C-alpha cells in the first residue's frame, strides 16, 4: 500500500507509451519525460480506458493553435477569459475529446491556472470519454454546489463544474500534498474521487 509503487508506475508507463505521442521538432526531452511521469500517477483503470478509446495525449513543441487540428481556435477567447485580451493562442493545453499539451508549461502560472497542466487536461478527457460527462451528473452537481469554490478561482472553478472536476482530479493525483489539501478543503469531492477509483 506504499511498498509496491514501482509496479504501478511500470504498468502506467507501459499504458502511457500507447497513449502519449511526441511531436516533431525540437523540445526539452527531459521535461516531456517528466510530464509522462506525472501522468503515471493517475489510476491505471482510467489510463487503460483512455487507451481503449484511442485517445492520444499529444505533447507539443510549440503553441496550441500552431497545430493544424487546433488552428480553428486562433483568435478565439476561452470561456471565462472575456476581458483579458488573451486567446487560445496564449493557452498551453486543452482537454476533452482530445488532449494537447505544450512541453514546459506544466506548472501553475505557465499561461494557465491549474495546479498541473497535464493532469487537469487529461482529467477533462477522463470526464468526457471514460465517465460519460460525470461533471454534469446530478450527484456531482450537489457536491459542486457545496465545495466548488474551495479550491479558489471562484468565478471560474466555482461556476463551471467541468473545471472544478478537472482541478480536483489534478489535486487528487499530483502529489501527496495536493491530495491532502483536497481532502481538507473538499471532503465530499475527495470521497467521490476515491470511490470512483475503487
Ligand atoms: Ni505498499
Ligand atoms: Zn480546463
* R_g over Cα of the chain: 16
Any binding-site annotation on 156?
yes
Kindly identify the ligand whose nearest atom is closest to the C-alpha of 4.
1
CA-CA distance, 103 to 60, in Å (whole number)? 6
CA-CA distance, 1 to 3, in Å (whole number)? 6
**Residues within 5 Å of ion ligand 1, judged at the Cβ atom:** 1-4
Which experimental method was this entry solved with? Answer: X-ray
CA-CA distance, 82 to 78, in Å (whole number)? 7
Evaluate the CA torsion angle 118, 186, 162, 48 in order and state its sign. positive
Distances (CA, A) of 18 to 12, 58, 118, 163, 179: 10, 12, 16, 26, 27
Grid cell at residue 7? 509496479
Instruction: Verify whether residue 121 is a known catalytic residue.
Output: yes
CA-CA distance, 187 to 172, in Å (whole number)? 11
Kindly identify the ligand whose nearest atom is closest to the C-alpha of 168.
2
CA-CA distance, 51 to 20, in Å (whole number)? 10
Q: Are 112 and 106 in contact (CB under 8 A)?
A: no
CA–centroid distance, 6 to ligand 1, in Å, is 10
Three-state secondary-structure class, residue 67: coil
Q: Are 49 and 85 in contact (CB under 8 A)?
A: no
Grid cell at residue 164? 472544478
**Catalytic-role residue among 118, 121, 147, 167:** 121
CA-CA distance, 170 to 182, in Å (whole number)? 10
Grid cell at residue 158? 466555482
Q: What burial letters (b/e) apply to 161-183, b meaning 16+ CB within 10 Å?
A: bbbbbbbbbbbbbbeeebbebbb
Q: What burial letters (b/e) apply to 66-80, b meaning 16+ CB within 10 Å?
A: ebeebeebeeebbee
Identify the burial level of 195 via C-beta atoms within 10 angstroms of its C-beta, where 0-12 means exposed, 13-18 middle and 19 or more buried.
exposed
Q: Please name the residue that has the C-alpha cell 476515491.
A: 194
| Given resolution (angstroms) | 1.4
Q: How many residues does the chain have?
A: 198
Grid cell at residue 133? 460527462
Amino acid at each position: 500500500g506504499s511498498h509496491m509503487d514501482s509496479t504501478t508506475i511500470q504498468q502506467n508507463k507501459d499504458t502511457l507509451s500507447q497513449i502519449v505521442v511526441f511531436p516533431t521538432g525540437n523540445y526539452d526531452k527531459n521535461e516531456a519525460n517528466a510530464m509522462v511521469n506525472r501522468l503515471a500517477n493517475i489510476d491505471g483503470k482510467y489510463l487503460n480506458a483512455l487507451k481503449q478509446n484511442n485517445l492520444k495525449i499529444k505533447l507539443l513543441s510549440g503553441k496550441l493553435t500552431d497545430e493544424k487540428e487546433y488552428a480553428y481556435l486562433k483568435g478565439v477567447v476561452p470561456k471565462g477569459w472575456e476581458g483579458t485580451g488573451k486567446t487560445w493562442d496564449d493557452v498551453p493545453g486543452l482537454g476533452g475529446s482530445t488532449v494537447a499539451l505544450r512541453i514546459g508549461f506544466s506548472n501553475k502560472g505557465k499561461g494557465h491556472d491549474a495546479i498541473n497542466l497535464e493532469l487537469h487536461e487529461t482529467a477533462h478527457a477522463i470526464d468526457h470519454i471514460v465517465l460519460n460527462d460525470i461533471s454534469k451528473s446530478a450527484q456531482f452537481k450537489q457536491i459542486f454546489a457545496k465545495e466548488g469554490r474551495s479550491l479558489g478561482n471562484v468565478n471560474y472553478l466555482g461556476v463551471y463544474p467541468a473545471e472544478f472536476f478537472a482541478e480536483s482530479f489534478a489535486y487528487y493525483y499530483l502529489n501527496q500534498d495536493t491530495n491532502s489539501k483536497l481532502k481538507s478543503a473538499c471532503p465530499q469531492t475527495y470521497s467521490f474521487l476515491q470511490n470512483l477509483a475503487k
